[model samples]
Target: NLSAKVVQGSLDSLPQAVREFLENNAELCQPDHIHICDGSEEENGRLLGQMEEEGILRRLKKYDNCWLALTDPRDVARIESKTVIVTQEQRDTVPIPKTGLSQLGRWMSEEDFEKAFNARFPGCMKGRTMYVIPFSMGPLGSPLSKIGIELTDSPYVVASMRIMTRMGTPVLEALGDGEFVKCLHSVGCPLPLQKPLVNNWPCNPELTLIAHLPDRREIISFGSGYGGNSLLGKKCFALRMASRLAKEEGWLAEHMLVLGITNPEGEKKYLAAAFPSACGKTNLAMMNPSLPGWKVECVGDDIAWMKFDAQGHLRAINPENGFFGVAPGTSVKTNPNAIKTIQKNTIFTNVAETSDGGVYWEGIDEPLASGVTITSWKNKEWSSEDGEPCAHPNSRFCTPASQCPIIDAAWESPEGVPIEGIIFGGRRPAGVPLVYEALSWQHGVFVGAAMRSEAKIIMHDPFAMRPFFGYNFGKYLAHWLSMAQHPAAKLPKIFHVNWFRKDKEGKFLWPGFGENSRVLEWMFNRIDGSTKLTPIGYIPKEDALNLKGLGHINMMELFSISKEFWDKEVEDIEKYLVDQVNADLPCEIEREILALKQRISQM
Candidate 1:
């Protein structure tokens, strides 16, 4: 059924549905060659060779199997406007279900879905290679893991997927007859007839579509080749598709990071924290603690697929095998483990290239040698005289989690780690405290539901999942409530933390990064009933922090609640919950807001 008569392994090894899905898309797109990924060294080498030959990748110097890929500036981020959802019927689009609408993207019926999909996909892969990459979200065979197959025309995407997901024949073998999510992607450009197609980066940003079909449990992304767009496994399937499945199966797919912390007494505690994009999530996950006898190990840095265990404890698995992290702000001071992790076998995108075959970005602790020529992310020779930054702030590094210096030994263990705390961190420069616990599960759900970003704007990213959740936000919260109600659900304690609080002149009040381990130690202590209560929730006393041999920190402002700013925060949260975005939230959310209002009355 393959056009190139190429299948890495026998088709009989795969499920009938998977085989059929590949055949239909191969026929629909009609590419020149088809390659099935095996997730092996040979497969990766071959794909990297092809990518380099085609000018899709530039091998980096002084590293073990590292390369650079500079994408078109137009296709830097996920084009949310083009991302859509197609339901089985128009009735599903009705807002009454409390889900199913992107602020920028829209919902469609199967009728119009075809009209849009058919117009863009057919013959779009002409004269190109079609890559079938089979992958698993978590550890293969783990109950939290889910199988997926992405059919794409970009070798770059396939190569990146190999690192980002556990892909290859083992995953194929494991999915003997188990159902899998079908993902089809295209760069939305066919090769010109009898002429070599040229462009380091080829994409049709305007025509880009990241569509999720919930009724059929399928995903399609066309046009752009950005990480979140064509890498289908990352957001499209892992969160968007899995969220829908979790909603139906009574589990959870959340945009949260999982980490295991071992304190001084050798006690281990796992925590899942949610922070919106570019909010130091990866840094925290791979932190090299500043405090003595405290170690933090990363399970995953981005998304968590969670379920209840036999002990009624909420457990979560980091479905991704690697970290697709932002590169600009990563440094030894910010994330030492990340620097070590990406030292080899990493795929960098939109970041500046060093003179010695290394990578360079702004805020990196390393200094560039004098008189050395460097290439900007735009592939142009860059100089400090230029106003534009040497590297794109949104530049990325795709490196395997196995490379992480602080990766947990049991990061990929079956059934995942039992979560002790579910922390919610935001980018608020003021109002929210450094760390505070929720009074109850319902209130914790409220804090997350009312979660918003504050990088000079209040972009509501509930649970850091504003863009990831596939179903209704209200219903998604209800799912959280439902999990708490389950007999086997030992819902983890919920806490809110803000690390980016700024003082006058825009200077940070708290030194984050490794210093964040202090907060984790406090959270672990709080789990053991070693916490002081505030009007808002449980918090660390002024003397509770591990300030031994630490840098100066403004103790007063760290926990001080400014009514001048909090009054506005209270009004804003009310507006957001009542009528701003989530018009109809869970009934408990209303009560939580009332309780918060009552708490603030005294403050």
Candidate 2:
């Protein structure tokens, strides 16, 4: 069979250890047939049809071209709910530690984790056909991209992977005689879920194990069929495993988005920004500027890999070929391009079904009529009177990057774009500025390392909060320090932005949907050395911000940080440093914190 020939061709180049594991698993699973994905539209459609016949997916014919609807079991619908990193010891070397493991599970060592995973994974694939997905993380020919082999038992995962990566024969060709990461995934249970736990979400510790072997450049995932666990290429290797590899190979793997902007003067530049979940990162990457003559182009919606080029300037690439974007709160007024991208040939997970056999999610447009019955994510019929959302809070859309109207023309370039600005942000309604620059890269690294947000209630402090570093704060800062020390590294200007700042009445001061262009214009001005500076960083003149259609917004307070907030930050910074000490908090971070404390104390 052609599939067999292709699979054998790809495997011929893989290490013997990897080939043995694949052969052993193939024997144990005893699949009915094996298909090697070749990145063809015909093949994708065939797989989708097979999945529909097997009752794993439903087709939505109303979306012009056939679209797929995946109703995940309630529990396994989302990211393993939380993630885990199983390593030899819980240390800075391991991105996640023991305290973090309390929420995210952990295993002792690579061998111990392999033992547990193997025991569960062997017979889990019975009565299923395996699909082999050979994929690349970035552009196929790019020096920055890496190759991986993902053998899965779920056609749903295969479909999503096709959209998210450059999968099939081209990727297989790229892996010729080169090292490739091996990723193995199985649902851990056979198809047509059994009666007792069929309705229940099939997610528990025993059925959900995500193990990564960094040294071996391999990942093993079993049980849950969620994106975070099943889409092994995304968070598993692209971020967690790649971060460790970048550290060893002299690059940076960050949870950031890349974008390019052009001003009225015909000047263009790129930026790489990082923000936590629900913090408007994707919206910013695909922003429709409210200001005239200022344009924003989407280079990437999520995840940027940065490295120093021969010119010593930092260059970046979007490791993913498509957007696995959050669906709620996305609309014409919010992110039009995102909505348009999902109109055809897309896979929607945990979203609502319209009466016309279409898809609908919260915050898409006007509310559905009171009497209209809609299918909810839980497969229950719902209406407006129920006062419940039709779609899951974490619903997602998988679509190709080419569908985005504002996508950058050079998105496929292997060299990527030079980054002129770097931004770090978090969700804090108070104690943060709308936009401000850092004095140096070290200060910016401190801002990112000590990034904070208000989450829970602690005693009587209204601003009581939690730390939200881009994955691991200590290691995150360490990576930045290493880059700063590199002889060939040249960094872009750094800035901090907070669009979620609130007023005394608790309403947002900034009209954040698209009016954020004014902030970007100001940041770009600073980058070009045309903006005024303050003791802390760049400060704008009273009339600098373009508030044309914003209508009565408090421009002054929204653009400025409060002195009282910084006065209280000193103690918080001290406590955070103490908490991270065991994770190898660098002396340079301590110095930056002390310097910030002194500067704010004077203020």
Number of the top-ranking candidate, with lDDT as the measure: 1
* Deviating ranges (above 4 Å) for candidate 2: 1-21, 28-32, 76-82, 95-107, 191-206, 367-373, 454-475, 530-536
Instruction: Encode model 2's per-residue lDDT on 142-187: one tens digit a residue.
Output: 6679988898888888889999999988887777667788898887
Residue 47's lDDT within candidate 2 is: 82
lDDT of 1 by residue, 112-229 (tens): 8898988899999998878888899889876668889999988899889999999998898888778898999998878773323334788887678889998787899898999999
lDDT measured at residue 392 in model 1 versus the true structure, 0 to 100? 91
**How many residue pairs clash (N, CA or C atoms closer than 3 angstroms) in each of the candidate models, in the order given?**
4, 0
Error of 1 at 529 (Å): 1.2
lDDT for 295 in candidate 1 is 88
lDDT for each candidate structure: 0.83, 0.73
